[PDB]
């Protein structure tokens with residue numbers, strides 16, 4: 001699995017479950033093309049978005065629907081979403097974990113990139 | 117001043133100076149409309165982006181050019197940029213400080229929202 | 233003012249007001265010696281802890297009473313406190329801002345160190 | 349495994365490997381008693397610190413030797429270490445993951461607490 005996303009809740013100290021996200025890849029015409037989508041599991045993780053063969057070099061965007069997560073808990077959060085945009089596989093294939101740690105008025109995000 | 121952005125560097129322990137950013141407002145057709153731009157000062161801050169009369173309710177986006185910042189320091193970055201998207205003034209005008217704490221493979225962002 | 237502490241609340245999107253903290257200097261026998269204390273202002277800041285002549289080289293600890301902060305807001309916290317330990321002035325006097333961004337189950341801390 | 353620690357490097361986007369840490373438990377006399385120790389693996393994780401039977405209610409401290417990690421990379425970091433202090437198992441047994449995300453002048457820490 002070359003691309004995995006993990007989302008955590010900093011208020012309750014838990015995985016952020018059932019968080020929707022969409023992944024896009026930048027095309028030759030510089031537009032954003034849909035690439036994959038899914039929702040986080042009970043562990044806060046979303047696996048199985050792509051394969052090594054499909055996940056070619058390019059600029060990718062992960063848009064995480066953090067607002068709907070908070071709204072379902074009764075909270076009106078600051079951010080409309082959390083977007084993570086990055087170039088992938090520019091030096092050959094790598095495995096990417098994108099993590100996001102959520103609070104109502106803040107988020108952190110980090111990438112763990114490993115060589116298979 | 118209703119909108120200020122502050123950027124810090126977690127590698128050097130310093131303000132992030134000369135970081136460029138652009139601010140957009142969401143248009144009726146879901147496109148991003150130019151609104152303001154600037155670069156951070158020696159204190160890591162960008163002031164004077166808008167006025168209280170111009171800064172009406174709506175969805176706003178701040179795109180911070182973190183990649184150029186790290187490249188100018190000779191450090192390899194992960195992200196293409198750091199985007200912050202939020203709805204402003206939905207409960208009356210507020211003063212917004214958007215802060216971003218930058219590392220090459222991670223960033224944090226938070227909002228400090230105060231009522232004058 | 234060579235040492236300032238700023239505390240922010242990631243749940244409310246606000247300065248963390250009335251947060252108590254104590255500062256210690258490490259003694260020759262490896263024990264922590266009282267140095268200063270205070271509580272954050274309406275801007276989340278605590279100034280005036282020491283003077284340039286008193287703030288000599290050494291190892292310092294700031295213990296921030298985050299648990300009492302969250303309890304006073306009726307929110308369950310994870311940590312007993314947030315401690316920041318650092319060596320000061322090892323390359324000449326600097327001005328230190330210690331910042332902490334608080335959530336109930338997470339915190340971030342960073343230092344902004346500038347040379348006058 | 350009721351207590352696990354994970355350490356990540358925000359500069360390189362990688363696990364922080366071979367990071368030493370010591371865990372302490374507060375005794376009846378309010379002193380810190382050694383509880384466990386270890387170093388992070390190639391995945392940045394330290395498992396096997398304790399058992400459900402031994403990991404009784406109490407206040408625990410994890411002291412992560414972040415300074416030695418940075419110094420081995422040639423870097424003089426801000427913090428002497430990163431300490432995480434928390435009450436555990438006050439409402440019955442739980443499983444704790446303590447994570448720390450490291451930069452030279454900043455760290456973040458969060459807890460994921462689950463019910464077995």
Ligand SMILES: COc1cc(C(=O)c2cc(O)cc(F)c2)cc([N+](=O)[O-])c1O
Pocket residue numbers: 122124213215216217224225226228238240329330331332333340341342344
């Ligand atoms: C309101 O203005 C400021 C905001 C902030 C932060 O948001 C912050 C963000 C983080 O991820 C971690 C942290 F410890 C602080 C830091 C400083 N500072 O240090 O000067 C400010 O003046």
Ligand SMILES: COc1cc(C(=O)c2cc(O)cc(F)c2)cc([N+](=O)[O-])c1O
Pocket residue numbers: 006008097098099100101108109110112354356445446447448449456457458459460
């Ligand atoms: C990629 O794997 C993980 C990443 C992360 C973070 O990004 C993280 C973010 C922060 O602001 C602070 C922190 F201490 C960790 C947290 C966990 N975790 O808790 O299990 C992971 O497994």
